[PDB]
Design a protein around this ligand. Structure first.
Ligand SMILES: Nc1ncnc2c1ncn2[C@@H]1O[C@H](CO)[C@@H](NC(=O)[C@H](N)Cc2ccc(O)cc2)[C@H]1O
Ligand SMILES: Nc1ncnc2c1ncn2[C@@H]1O[C@H](CO)[C@@H](NC(=O)[C@H](N)Cc2ccc(O)cc2)[C@H]1O
Lengths: 154, 154
């Protein structure tokens, strides 16, 4: 599993209504762009969940890297992104072969979302719209960008 | 050397003087660039070639088909040491892998110069290295790409 975590003052997420309208909004918090690998297991997901929730990305009391999202009662917007498995190693056109197929990915993603809300709180976890074109107006704070690939630890 | 490339409709970059705008792009890419203490010129040339050549926009009916240069779009290069934020140990990132600020700035300035030489002086915008930045961004897709050059054989 791969995640890019960005620290924000706000994020406004919107989709097409045409078959843009705002479907989700956060203030202070994190936006987490999350890629599900075809071989991901529950263990991968748990590690990402723990890290997003516990990473000390805010300053407190004139001390750096001190507080996490839960501490400050901040929000998280979770956005599904298969582009992180974009192989850029060959030429100009990225391929996305490492990504989990969208049907499996969706149920996996929903499970992750539920697990997020379980360790924190239902009101503090916002999502986008798996499989849909999205527009996200984001106020980047710092900016602070953290990358994690689970294929590198335990 | 590490980079997070995001596809944008626009990005407005602001620093504390309260917030003065120093830099603005419409359509293009924002690149969050982290320089590693052992990075060579070759690592840079690989990132530059990729930000410039990767086919990240669709083109009516065709998917992942056009790059930033094809479309005559812009690039906002933003210096980011948080990409060397190691989060494997505790929950406080450490940044020992990141090249020291003055050497980093010198290297970053060269990188900007080579971007301009490979594309166009007018099309490459930057942040304020070493400074707190606020970045109002409109993510388009979203599309997020991560590259680490120590994962490939130059
Ligand atoms: N493996 C996956 N991990 C995370 N999200 C996934 C994965 N597979 C599918 N998705 C979801 O399905 C969408 C389109 O396939 C994924 N969407 C995206 O990555 C962005 N909306 C960008 C995008 C850009 C172009 C395009 O043709 C499709 C999507 C994600 O919401
Ligand atoms: N090795 C480096 N690679 C890229 N940028 C670097 C590097 N070293 C220093 N910088 C620049 O100097 C700042 C502090 O080191 C870096 N700033 C940032 O990464 C963002 N403003 C995030 C931030 C936010 C707060 C803070 O106290 C430090 C950093 C970067 O612009």
């Amino acid at each position: 599993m791969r995640v890019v975590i960005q620290r924000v003052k706000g994020a406004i997420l919107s989709v097409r209504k045409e078959n843009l309208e705002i479907i989700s909004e956060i203030k202070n918090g994190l936006i987490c762009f999350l890629g599900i690998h075809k071989n991901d297991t529950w263990e991968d997901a748990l590690y990402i969940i723990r890290k997003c929730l516990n990473l000390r990305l805010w300053n407190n009391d004139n001390k750096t890297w001190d507080k996490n999202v839960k501490d400050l009662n901040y929000e998280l917007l979770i956005v599904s992104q298969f582009t992180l498995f974009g192989n850029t190693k060959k030429g100009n056109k990225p391929d996305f072969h490492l990504a989990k197929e969208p049907n499996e990915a969706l149920i996996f993603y929903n499970k992750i979302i539920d697990e997020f809300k379980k360790q924190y709180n239902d009101d503090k976890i916002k999502i986008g719209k798996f499989g849909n074109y999205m527009n996200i107006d984001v106020t980047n704070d710092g900016p602070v960008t953290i990358y994690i690939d689970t294929h590198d630890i335990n």
